[PDB]
Amino acid sequence: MREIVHIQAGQCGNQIGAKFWEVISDEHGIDPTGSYHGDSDLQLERINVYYNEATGNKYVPRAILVDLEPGTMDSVRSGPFGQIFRPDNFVFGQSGAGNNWAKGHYTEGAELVDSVLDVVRKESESCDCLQGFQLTHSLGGGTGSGMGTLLISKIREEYPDRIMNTFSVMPSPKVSDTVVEPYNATLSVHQLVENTDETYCIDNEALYDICFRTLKLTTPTYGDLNHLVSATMSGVTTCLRFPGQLNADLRKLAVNMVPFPRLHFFMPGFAPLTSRGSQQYRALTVPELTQQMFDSKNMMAACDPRHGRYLTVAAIFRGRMSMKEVDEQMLNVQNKNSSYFVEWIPNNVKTAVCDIPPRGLKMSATFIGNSTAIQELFKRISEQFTAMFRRKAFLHWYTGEGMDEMEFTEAESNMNDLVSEYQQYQDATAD
């Protein structure tokens, strides 16, 4: 378990995906050209997980950039780490998906997916021990949702023994008031329950409410939202990019986090919350990080964890702190919030401490939770999907590309079964 092949599809996938490489390269001491500028040996011991070693001590990210819209292609090169990506790993079509899930999954994106698989096989064979694949994309669009889920099914059928991991962003009317997004998200969730082992739910509803109400940003921008995403993606991948024993690979994380195959949607959280202007934010204490981590205002998914029960929880502490104090606070919050954990999974909270904190912070806490409260997120999309689907609004945009209308009823039925399954274990007791 070593290398991980990163893929980013669509405008949102490349937006948060480029910001992801900008943040972790700064942590590993890699400049935009690819040279190692770090002053700590701990930054290169696990560098082969996300990077490939090239020429004169040049590290190249093992990333694949895909989008049906050629516009976002040049937007990545205009960024900071634009040239660090391999030019062969740019697979871009001719016209955008137009927020149509059927165009990305069945017609336009179905043509370009063969060109993407060739780049995946090229990177896969260049790995000693491939862990799996990680994907960043949105569910409300057409490219990242439609073609992303298609690319997942084609990859999982060639590399079935590998772990499929996604960073999927959830639509929200507060960010993008496009009414077909419930359609695209529901059809994608139906794909993610069957063809992914781990899925981090990054809700734009939560990102907006954190920027608007907590961070007091009157008009949140995509840069303000992606700042929370990159800070979360860096935290959830800490145990993969640094030496450790707790959840050090994608498979050991999945075995500890996914008690049932369909319930593999994680609720991420981060502490403390920054707003791109930290100024002189003091380092919080271990009890403050523990309490703020399980706070509903710190979750990247618009869900109240006090409304459900934690099936499994992984906590990642970063920075110089007492290992004994972390053990005390984690065992303390499990007694205070005893009723918010299922009692038929003993020792379902695992804690890992990393010595290297992220940039601009000295004490950070990352929260990865498999909570039954995530059903509030799916219920919200299901109600918006049902409101549109009952009136058959804009249904011909999808049936005009080869989709059968029974795929909508199957995606709706499959997602409702997912909600009832979360409620099934939220009420189950140990007798």
Partner: protein, 155 residues
């Protein structure tokens, strides 16, 4: 038959085609297989000019399809604020109820059209209106945890 052509012209946003067809006797209140009028399709696809033209030529602003949807239901659902106000100006039943118990306030609240929610409230939207499952517009905001919507429903 000019009824089918007026339906397609209203859906596609062909302003000139709509005016020509009405001059030749096209049924402004024609219906498709589901009972949708050209005003339904115009209000759905955001063709504001065609909405005003139809209303000036005997279009029933409170027409319903098989599922009991008025043009105001669809305009509130899709989120066309300009069309919502034009429909209300021409006598749209703000508290029309479809076969699912939904009022235009329900659909505007579910889809997150907070501006349309405010406009409907100013025109007598019954906040006590329950759908087929007993939920009101306020219940939808509390169940979904939409604090922004819950504040608007308190004025």
């Amino acid at each position: 038959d000019l009824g089918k052509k007026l339906l397609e012209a209203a859906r596609a946003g062909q302003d000139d085609e709509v005016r020509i067809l009405m001059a030749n006797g096209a049924d402004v209140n024609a219906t498709d297989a589901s009972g949708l009028t050209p005003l339904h399709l115009a209000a759905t696809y955001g063709h504001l000019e065609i909405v005003e033209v139809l209303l000036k030529h005997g279009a029933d602003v409170n027409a319903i399809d098989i599922m009991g949807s008025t043009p105001l239901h669809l305009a509130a659902l899709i989120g066309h604020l300009e069309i919502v106000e034009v429909l209300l100006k021409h006598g749209a039943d703000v508290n029309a109820v479809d076969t699912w118990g939904d009022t235009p306030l329900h659909l505007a609240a579910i889809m997150g059209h907070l501006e349309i929610v405010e406009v409907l409230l100013k025109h007598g939207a019954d906040v006590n209106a329950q759908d087929k499952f007993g939920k009101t517009a306020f219940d939808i905001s509390i169940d979904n945890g939409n604090e922004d919507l819950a504040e608007i429903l308190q004025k």
